[PDB]
Design a protein around this ligand. Sequence first.
Ligand SMILES: *[C@@H]1O[C@H](CO)[C@@H](O)[C@H](O)[C@H]1NC(C)=O
Ligand SMILES: *[C@@H]1O[C@H](CO)[C@@H](O)[C@H](O)[C@H]1NC(C)=O
Ligand SMILES: *[C@@H]1O[C@H](CO)[C@@H](O)[C@H](O)[C@H]1NC(C)=O
Ligand SMILES: *[C@@H]1O[C@H](CO)[C@@H](O)[C@H](O)[C@H]1NC(C)=O
Ligand SMILES: *[C@@H]1O[C@H](CO)[C@@H](O)[C@H](O)[C@H]1NC(C)=O
Ligand SMILES: *[C@@H]1O[C@H](CO)[C@@H](O)[C@H](O)[C@H]1NC(C)=O
Ligand SMILES: *[C@@H]1O[C@H](CO)[C@@H](O)[C@H](O)[C@H]1NC(C)=O
Ligand SMILES: *[C@@H]1O[C@H](CO)[C@@H](O)[C@H](O)[C@H]1NC(C)=O
Lengths: 366, 346, 50, 198, 50, 224
Amino acid sequence: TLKSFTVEKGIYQTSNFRVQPTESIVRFPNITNLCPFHEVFNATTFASVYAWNRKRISNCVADYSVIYNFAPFFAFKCYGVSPTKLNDLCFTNVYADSFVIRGNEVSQIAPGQTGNIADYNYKLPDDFTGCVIAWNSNKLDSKPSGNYNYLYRLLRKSKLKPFERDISTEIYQAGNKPCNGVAGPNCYSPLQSYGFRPTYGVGHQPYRVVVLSFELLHAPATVCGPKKSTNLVKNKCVNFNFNGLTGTGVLTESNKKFLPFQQFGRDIADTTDAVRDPQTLEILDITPCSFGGVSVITPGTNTSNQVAVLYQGVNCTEVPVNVFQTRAGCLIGAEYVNNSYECDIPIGAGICASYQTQSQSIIAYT
Amino acid sequence: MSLGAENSVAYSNNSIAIPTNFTISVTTEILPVSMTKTSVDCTMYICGDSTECSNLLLQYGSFCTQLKRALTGIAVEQDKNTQEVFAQVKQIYKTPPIKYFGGFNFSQILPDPSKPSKRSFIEDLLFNKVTLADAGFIKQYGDCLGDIAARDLICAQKFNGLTVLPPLLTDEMIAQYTSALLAGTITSGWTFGAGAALQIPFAMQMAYRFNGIGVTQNVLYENQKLIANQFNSAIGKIQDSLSSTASALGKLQDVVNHNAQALNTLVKQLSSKFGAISSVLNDILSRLDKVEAEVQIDRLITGRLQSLQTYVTQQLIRAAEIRASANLAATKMSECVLGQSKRVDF
Amino acid sequence: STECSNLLLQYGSFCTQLKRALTGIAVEQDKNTQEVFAQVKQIYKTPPIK
Amino acid sequence: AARDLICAQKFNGLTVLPPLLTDEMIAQYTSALLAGTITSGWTFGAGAALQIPFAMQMAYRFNGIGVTQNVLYENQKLIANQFNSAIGKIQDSLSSTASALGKLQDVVNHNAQALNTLVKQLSSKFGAISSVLNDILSRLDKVEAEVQIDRLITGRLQSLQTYVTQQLIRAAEIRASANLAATKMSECVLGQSKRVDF
Amino acid sequence: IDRLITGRLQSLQTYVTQQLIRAAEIRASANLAATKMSECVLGQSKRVDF
Amino acid sequence: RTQSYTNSFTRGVYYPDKVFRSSVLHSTHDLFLPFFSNVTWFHAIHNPALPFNDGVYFASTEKSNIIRGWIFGTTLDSKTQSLLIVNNATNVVIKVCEFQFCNDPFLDVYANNCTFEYVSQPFLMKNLREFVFKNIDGYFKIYSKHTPINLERDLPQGFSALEPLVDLPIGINITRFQTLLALHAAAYYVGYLQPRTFLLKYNENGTITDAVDCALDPLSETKC
Ligand SMILES: *[C@@H]1O[C@H](CO)[C@@H](O)[C@H](O)[C@H]1NC(C)=O
Ligand SMILES: *[C@@H]1O[C@H](CO)[C@@H](O)[C@H](O)[C@H]1NC(C)=O
Ligand SMILES: *[C@@H]1O[C@H](CO)[C@@H](O)[C@H](O)[C@H]1NC(C)=O
Ligand SMILES: *[C@@H]1O[C@H](CO)[C@@H](O)[C@H](O)[C@H]1NC(C)=O
Ligand SMILES: *[C@@H]1O[C@H](CO)[C@@H](O)[C@H](O)[C@H]1NC(C)=O
Ligand SMILES: *[C@@H]1O[C@H](CO)[C@@H](O)[C@H](O)[C@H]1NC(C)=O
Ligand SMILES: *[C@@H]1O[C@H](CO)[C@@H](O)[C@H](O)[C@H]1NC(C)=O
Ligand SMILES: *[C@@H]1O[C@H](CO)[C@@H](O)[C@H](O)[C@H]1NC(C)=O
């Protein structure tokens, strides 16, 4: 700490001691069903852009390594999460949205975009988390005559809110004269076909898009990845894993009156203080393991090599991981005497340390 | 606003005004001397029980070493301030068991052996008036481990690497120094501050004090009972005003409130995101791959380092102000108590 | 600017303590002036004879 | 004419607060102290104001410095003439030389220069593509403009905290000077000081 | 280079702030030394422990 | 129908998140009903459909199953998907599609593109029932509270924090709003939410006992 090969006389704050964790704890809900990711990635025809199909996924074990074996994609673009970490972490709800768009507007499926699909057909929220999967579908969704089974909205009278779907087909009005159900002058049908052909360029090919949106909330967890749950041990400094988030601390029984809809407790500094076990309905407190400061009391190297260690702010008659108790911590390696001299090396509340012949040792005194 | 009462003193070139009586006035001056000693652990505050964040924090150089050096210098300076204010006497003097000092009553400022902390009545009132912030100078990990009632601010400060160090001199030693100064001043006068303590009766000492201010010493020897009664009434008025009014000690309370508020703001700054996706470190570790979490952790590291640097700078400025006040208090201890001052309004 | 304010809310309480420091300085200036000048108890006047 | 510096400071959130005591109240305090020290002497600072003729007060002041009081009563006209000539010389020196009041002008110049630097720091890019915030908002989508706005916010916050830190240090220096001025008011005006070069 | 520039600006500003605080302390000590030159050497002092 | 006006009287505060907090003063920004606002008193003895202006708030001083069900959506009788809730003594049916409706939507005691269907527990078990409806980012949320009263004249003076019920992902456009009545003298209060900033107070038991606005009066801005 001093970056020197010799030390003077005094007290020095060197390092900090910390009780290391011993065991590991994984706590996940007891679910055995497998998620229907196989039923969403293959279909004869996907839904259109304006009528995109949302699938509700819950109460199953989700393996994301089988997504790669179900479709030949490249753009596995995730926004609030990494693709490699989707099995370790846990959440509460999955929604899968399926539609077929053109190749030039794949970049419009992103948060905070402006265009044709994003403004009028399918909008993603600004704080969106999840993954967007898109792959080419030239073999299945292209015909030489021209596809008329896929539609997109041309224009609307207002913008679209995120995750809003409309089905209605009304003739657009762009003037004072009403349409009255006739698509004549200033009257256009909003549904326009894509018209996919195999002779088109690479930017006009059909693309099958599957968008996974993950609910990262404080609801109880229903759907997430496979991790084996171990036994729960209390009053030990362990590493815990409660529904995805990890930490190091000691778990005790809690007298906090959690409401039935609540899951987590928080402190002033937005750290987790109380947690609910996912398997049994109980509340556990999270408090860190033992820590503190370490001070070293020494004379000079030209005098002696003996040191005394002060563990600041702990009660080492109880937890210690010549012993004297002080108001400034506790003292190891210095023998207390019932005398009174001038203060040589200060320690704390009226206690000083010196190095005298009463055979040489470090003494402590008032 | 009103500046004061309107007056017009009657000046004439052959007229003078001379007092025919006097009053004895006892006034109270309060000066801060020291403040709260703090120590901050960087690895526990910025990252906390994490290895990747510690390895990214070691790449920033020696910001935390000089922050720790500044805090250690402040902590040594506070004990130096207390030592230069109070530890001025070479020997611990004791008052005699007889309590007759010419009719002057010193019972409310001299200590009593009825309690283990030998403090006077006025010292007890001053200690009861200032509501402390319950700092961590006494170890409190046993109370922080046992989850009772609700989590306090002291445990939240302690769990994030902020620790309050106890002062070198306890309150009993400050009270003993004050009692030694009082005994020397009452018995010897100003002679104990310039060498050995030469005893003198209190009436003759107060007659010397009247010769200091330009009054003939026969005035005390003719009005000793009146002067003793005026001093006793002034001391009783001081005791009444300290038992009744609670706003006189606002400087020490302001010191305690500032030292609590800085640590509370330092704890509250840990819930900020600083442009990252989350303020929680473990969620960033468990939700992202290596490079993106490195970016988010570096944003959090820069924000927490800036907040800690701001705290250390404000502590240094407050320590400079407290050192100036302690130098003034030591000068007033040397010049008002150990002697008689001819300086006006000092 | 609303977007700048929403991104400035994420930085915590830096501006609160900046405003606290500036308010303390502004109070201290008037305290300095009152400590220097406001020493006399009563507003005395000189006689009209000079 | 043109845009002033004060309007540019006011339009960007920087405001100067007026002092609590006006110049008339400070002049009233000065006049009260002058009338008290002219009529009473040092008696008005130790309690009630007791009048005394000014010649007898000057005899008291001469007896304070170790000169016998008959010297004043024998050279009163010469002492009054010397005092009047010295006061006239101070009048002429303040009317002629402008270099005496440099400390107060230094205070005014520092307080103006810090705010001018704080205003001028708003035109820096701080690594972004523009220093104008609306151009960043208009020229980019949400994520990239969020990055540039974060850069601008970090730079402006650093400049603001630098200004606050130097203002705190200058406030400490000004408070030390004000404590010295209060001591000099208590010891030179309300009494007679035996301290050398005070 | 922007990361290096930000780090070196922060280190230089920390050095300048510490130098300013130390200059304030040295100025206070120099004022005390000037007062002790004026009152102890150029005259005789009646102040106790001065 | 009869329209009257009543002071809101600092009522209609809900929990902003599913996170336990104890002995803390928390500040949040969410769609809240402002304090001492102007809610509308409606008497059902008689009916155009009410607006849904960024969220609504209910109170109802009656009991049993005389009041039940709500209708959400922009239009009626197809042409737009519409959110529909039916409550009874056994079940709750939440369903979002077109349906067939008359000019007076009511449930008697004695469709084309239809997607979302939902079933859960009944909402119900000197009787006030509070309700807060919100529609943010294609999600629809219900908050509710069950509190008694001493005198049945107006809204009480006190704090009753509303707890969430369900977090439905409806994802339609909701601009107009119609309520449902049961036919074989119903009173309800309507108040509209606004983007206000609050300062909530939590006790040692974790429940909200006090709150303040931040733009009601300058004292509340000082407390902010
Ligand atoms: C696609 O999924 C279906 C189940 O919906 C399955 O029957 C079919 O074999 C899958 N396609 C391939 C090529 O395996
Ligand atoms: C999961 O464990 C809890 C705890 O006893 C139990 O009540 C519940 O029935 C279990 N669930 C399953 C599906 O086994
Ligand atoms: C903590 O230290 C105090 C000081 O001596 C002691 O009285 C108390 O028993 C200790 N607590 C334990 C050992 O749990
Ligand atoms: C003294 O005062 C009186 C009036 O108070 C005045 O008439 C007289 O001239 C004064 N003495 C001198 C020498 O001016
Ligand atoms: C001094 O004062 C105390 C309380 O004011 C009183 O009890 C005591 O008797 C007094 N001393 C004498 C000698 O009267
Ligand atoms: C609500 O608004 C109506 C509009 O006329 C008014 O009559 C009524 O007094 C208002 N309620 C209040 C202010 O409580
Ligand atoms: C959809 O809602 C928005 C506001 O919520 C409104 O402006 C718009 O007119 C609505 N759309 C239709 C077709 O009414
Ligand atoms: C918190 O709950 C306990 C348990 O009944 C109760 O005794 C106490 O009064 C409650 N505190 C409140 C309501 O402030």
